[PDB]
Structure 1
Amino acid sequence: PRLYFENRSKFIQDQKDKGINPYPHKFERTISIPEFIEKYKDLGNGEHLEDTILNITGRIMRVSASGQKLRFFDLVGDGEKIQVLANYSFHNHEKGNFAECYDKIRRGDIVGIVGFPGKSKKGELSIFPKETILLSACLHMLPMKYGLTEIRYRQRYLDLLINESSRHTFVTRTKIINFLRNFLNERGFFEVETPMMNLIAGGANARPFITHHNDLDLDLYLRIATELPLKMLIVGGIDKVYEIGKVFRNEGIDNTHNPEFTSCEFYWAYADYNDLIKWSEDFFSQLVYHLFGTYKISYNKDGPENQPIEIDFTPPYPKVSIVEEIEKVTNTILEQPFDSNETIEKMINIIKEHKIELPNPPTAAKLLDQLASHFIENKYNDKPFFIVEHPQIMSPLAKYHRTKPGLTERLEMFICGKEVLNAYTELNDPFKQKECFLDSAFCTSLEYGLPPTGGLGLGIDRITMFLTNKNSIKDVILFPTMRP
């Protein structure tokens, strides 16, 4: 263990003393492992192309029992593997002693090979080296397959080398974001970048990160959302605009919460709640189909040990009104204002009666949220669904519902009880922005005329979790935030 590293450390030094460079600068390779497999997978068993010289690189992930002049290795690159069949007959003895050269090779070593393509008699696609150079050695002992804990998160490179599902998961993540970008781009949307650091931190309910700028001698807040600046751009005449980037929220960590996570928000001039619902249904249905050739996926809601559930992404999705639903599953009528002494105490009695835990503070919005979490947000697990028409007290930036007083034109989409999407008709009457009478800069922009707008936010990481069958957000983030 500690000895292995010391030996390899010595070996590197010993090689240098012998004038050999264990870390050469440039090895010009002529073909990639995936390319190699594609161009030679259909060779006949035992067939050799001994005249076709190739330069190929990879990482040795398996060394076979040294035979009498016959050495076998597994070589991996870009998530694919071919066999290394070193044969004494084909060895270039000008470059060095056969057995001595390959006896040096250890598992994990990155090597560059000069050889020709062919299959073994058994029909295994292989590269036959005439020469093998060491490009970069592995000084530690790699875990065996199925051998790899918190190591996955702290040493992600080891996860990517050993666990095949790892590369697939993060490839899917990029495919997801790519798809999202093209989806918004194909429909006339314009991607921008707003500031990570601001004098204030809206628009969402979350404790911010605070940092300090030295030469300006200024205390800056890390953005918790992108909503405000993007809406100012709508005012600026960018009628379809969006941003895919990191946002920072200074709260608790768990399976669905990571301090910094990727979000996408777009704002869509002259669109509304109804446009937004249709968009959501269009996007998720098409996205899931694009990844799986079907609108149905399997997801292990209760973990890999328990039976998975099926999630049907076939549109349309159910819409559930938050207040009405709570009233219906409670046989109660929550009379407005929701923050009245009568209604608050009535919500509290529901929370005590049903054995639910009381929020703190016991504000109207907090109570409504807790009631929703218990009586609604798990109503459907077999398909996405929207909770809609949130009260204004929960939605300080959502435009008032056009027929339901006290409510707003807002929609959250849930997958297996987890919020992945938040959208509403943007409040654009500056007079109704009670806080403005938020950021001064934002408030002022409204006064110049925000047209009728629809805004939407996506939780990218959580969406990745569901489409990569993960129970934790740590599985869809390359370098999640870990306690040291």
Structure 2
Amino acid sequence: VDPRLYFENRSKFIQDQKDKGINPYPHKFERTISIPEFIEKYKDLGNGEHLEDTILNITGRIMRVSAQKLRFFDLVGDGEKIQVLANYSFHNHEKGNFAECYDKIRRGDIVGIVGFPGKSKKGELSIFPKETILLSACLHMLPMKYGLKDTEIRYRQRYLDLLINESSRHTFVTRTKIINFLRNFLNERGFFEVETPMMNLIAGGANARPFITHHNDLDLDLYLRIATELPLKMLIVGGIDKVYEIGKVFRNEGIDNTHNPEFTSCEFYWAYADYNDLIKWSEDFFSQLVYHLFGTYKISYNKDGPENQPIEIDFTPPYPKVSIVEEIEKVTNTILEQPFDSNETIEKMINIIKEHKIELPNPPTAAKLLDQLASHFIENKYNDKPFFIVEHPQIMSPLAKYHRTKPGLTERLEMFICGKEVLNAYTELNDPFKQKECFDSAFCTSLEYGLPPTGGLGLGIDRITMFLTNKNSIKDVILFPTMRP
């Protein structure tokens, strides 16, 4: 029938069943066992064995109906499935009519079943109901997995995605397992989880336009946080020497497969740690995280989509370290001299952009030219293993401490997976007089009270989940991505 017509039939059926005095949405059904526990407890029953002495109460959603006095159903719950075989021989006719009970049941209805466990004569693990009650009706027609495959409905109606395609549930189980592992990884090393405000009075910094909202009680316009960097460092001043936060941060810019205006970040700050501690932490976390999920350090990833051949990513540490300026000079055969914002070096960088591959010129400030020469010459050198780009010029990282030996550089590291930034870390500049941005006000004042030598690090949780669940879009690892209505 037409999907519009099917909905009106079940709607009239609900009120038609309310007119007969029946409540089609009962309040409570006291379940005794779950479908996963039911599978594990009765997996090894005989072919055709019936345990008609053990009576159980089970719930689930009906996802299949089959055909007299014999009826068959598929009962799905917690991502697993069993069969329902309603036999007229085992039905309790004192509690109601067999036909009238099972005729009204359709696919998608949530039911509670009182019956016994057993396997079919063909060897299908089933529950044999003596009684079946409708707990919640399904008004619409549920589509087949073909019906959800290549459409945007997976994002607009995520609940049908989780019901119909088993791989979707696995993606988000993996996401939670990743975040659980990270939180436990930090707590095992003495890190302390905190909450910092999501709205502040200082707009975004140098990267993206902010989300602007009005605080009614203060009559002020505030800005959603672009990062947890500043308040976490103030806690380091406060004596919380190992601190971190896992939460949402916002950048009011354009959406694409690896950028979402609202995304999940983890930042930690580690007093008395330096650039080398942050490198070893990254190599330890990612290698142990991949082994925790897969039992191996090698994963497969369809970088260019499931249509195309996948690449193998090896997370066996150690990972290569590539110095940005020295490697750009190696691959471009040039030498870029003292301050990179010089008119001579900016001319040389722009003369590399257009002389070499015609790739896209930009608004030409020195940090942007360097950032795009790195994206064209470095960020795709290694696609079979993660690697760090290190020792970024201080003109690209104002809050990163100056390099100990190389002038004009910092002790910064950025880890890449398949050309995409996944981690950002550096030792934090703690000399208030060398922080030109103070010569944001609450943070500069806190620096004057003494920030110890500190190493900070930032993780992209959504992108990490993308690579570990073999996804090409960030929308595939977010439960409810914001979509155009």
Q: TM-score, normalised by structure 1?
A: 0.98
Q: Deviations over 1:300-331 (max 9, x none)?
A: 00000000000000000000000011111101
Q: Distance in 2 between matches of 1:374 and 1:207?
A: 25
Q: Deviations over 1:33-71 (max 9, x none)?
A: 001111001100111111111110000000012xx2100
Q: Distance in 1 between matches of 2:187 and 2:207?
A: 29
1:203 touches 1:225 (CA, 8 Å); kept in 2? no
Q: Distance in 2 between matches of 1:461 and 1:286?
A: 18
Q: Distance in 1 between matches of 2:225 and 2:193?
A: 18
2:45 touches 2:119 (CA, 8 Å); kept in 1? yes
Q: Distance in 2 between matches of 1:427 and 1:63?
A: 66
Offset, 1:356: 3.7
Q: Deviations over 1:68-109 (max 9, x none)?
A: 210000000000001001000001111221112101000000
2:428 touches 2:455 (CA, 8 Å); kept in 1? yes
1:204 touches 1:225 (CA, 8 Å); kept in 2? no
Offset, 1:145: 2.7
Offset, 1:202: 5.2
Report the counterpart of residue 235 of structure 1 in structure 2.
237
Offset, 1:208: 1.3
Q: Distance in 2 between matches of 1:37 and 1:4?
A: 33
1:204 touches 1:224 (CA, 8 Å); kept in 2? no
Report the counterpart of residue 35 of structure 2 in structure 1.
33
Q: Distance in 1 between matches of 2:163 and 2:426?
A: 43
2:329 touches 2:335 (CA, 8 Å); kept in 1? yes
2:112 touches 2:132 (CA, 8 Å); kept in 1? yes
Q: Measured at CA, do residues 203 and 177 of structure 1 come closer, stay the same or move farther in structure 2, by a change above 3 Å? A: farther
1:202 touches 1:227 (CA, 8 Å); kept in 2? no
Aligned-residue Cα RMSD (Å) equals: 0.9
Q: Deviations over 1:118-171 (max 9, x none)?
A: 110111110010110000111001111333110001100010000100000000
Offset, 1:187: 0.3
Q: Deviations over 1:163-182 (max 9, x none)?
A: 10000000000000000000
Offset, 1:205: 2.2
1:194 touches 1:230 (CA, 8 Å); kept in 2? yes
Q: Distance in 2 between matches of 1:195 and 1:46?
A: 61
Is there any run of 5+ residues in structure 1 with no aligned partner, and where? none
Matched residue count: 481
Report the counterpart of residue 124 of structure 1 in structure 2.
124
Report the counterpart of residue 102 of structure 2 in structure 1.
102
Q: Distance in 2 between matches of 1:348 and 1:307?
A: 36
Offset, 1:388: 0.4
Offset, 1:201: 3.8
Q: Deviations over 1:441-471 (max 9, x none)?
A: 0000000000000000000000000000000
2:204 touches 2:210 (CA, 8 Å); kept in 1? no
Aligned pairs for 1:69-468 (under 5 A) are 69-148=69-148, 149-201=151-203, 205-437=207-439, 439-468=440-469
Q: Distance in 1 between matches of 2:399 and 2:260?
A: 24
1:203 touches 1:227 (CA, 8 Å); kept in 2? no
2:425 touches 2:455 (CA, 8 Å); kept in 1? yes
Q: TM-score, normalised by structure 2?
A: 0.98
Q: Distance in 2 between matches of 1:201 and 1:451?
A: 26
Offset, 1:413: 0.2
Q: Distance in 2 between matches of 1:285 and 1:186?
A: 16
Offset, 1:376: 0.6
Q: Distance in 2 between matches of 1:272 and 1:79?
A: 45
Q: Distance in 2 between matches of 1:325 and 1:142?
A: 55
2:350 touches 2:361 (CA, 8 Å); kept in 1? no
Q: Deviations over 1:329-360 (max 9, x none)?
A: 10111112100100001100111112344443
Q: Distance in 1 between matches of 2:357 and 2:211?
A: 34
Match of 1:431, SS state, is coil
Q: Measured at CA, do residues 115 and 369 of structure 1 come closer, stay the same or move farther in structure 2, by a change above 3 Å? A: same
2:83 touches 2:127 (CA, 8 Å); kept in 1? yes
Q: Deviations over 1:211-231 (max 9, x none)?
A: 111121001010000010000
1:359 touches 1:366 (CA, 8 Å); kept in 2? no
Offset, 1:203: 5.5
1:145 touches 1:162 (CA, 8 Å); kept in 2? yes
1:411 touches 1:422 (CA, 8 Å); kept in 2? yes
Q: Distance in 1 between matches of 2:382 and 2:223?
A: 37
Q: Which runs of 4+ in 1 moved over 4 A?
A: none
Match of 1:9, SS state, is helix
Q: Distance in 2 between matches of 1:151 and 1:204?
A: 36
Match of 1:128, SS state, is strand
1:387 touches 1:411 (CA, 8 Å); kept in 2? yes
Q: Distance in 1 between matches of 2:477 and 2:358?
A: 31
1:146 touches 1:163 (CA, 8 Å); kept in 2? no
1:409 touches 1:425 (CA, 8 Å); kept in 2? yes
Q: Distance in 2 between matches of 1:381 and 1:20?
A: 62
Match of 1:423, SS state, is strand
Q: Deviations over 1:260-307 (max 9, x none)?
A: 000000000000000000000000000000000000000000000000
Q: Measured at CA, do residues 237 and 203 of structure 1 come closer, stay the same or move farther in structure 2, by a change above 3 Å? A: farther
Q: Distance in 2 between matches of 1:53 and 1:255?
A: 51
Q: Measured at CA, do residues 204 and 57 of structure 1 come closer, stay the same or move farther in structure 2, by a change above 3 Å? A: farther
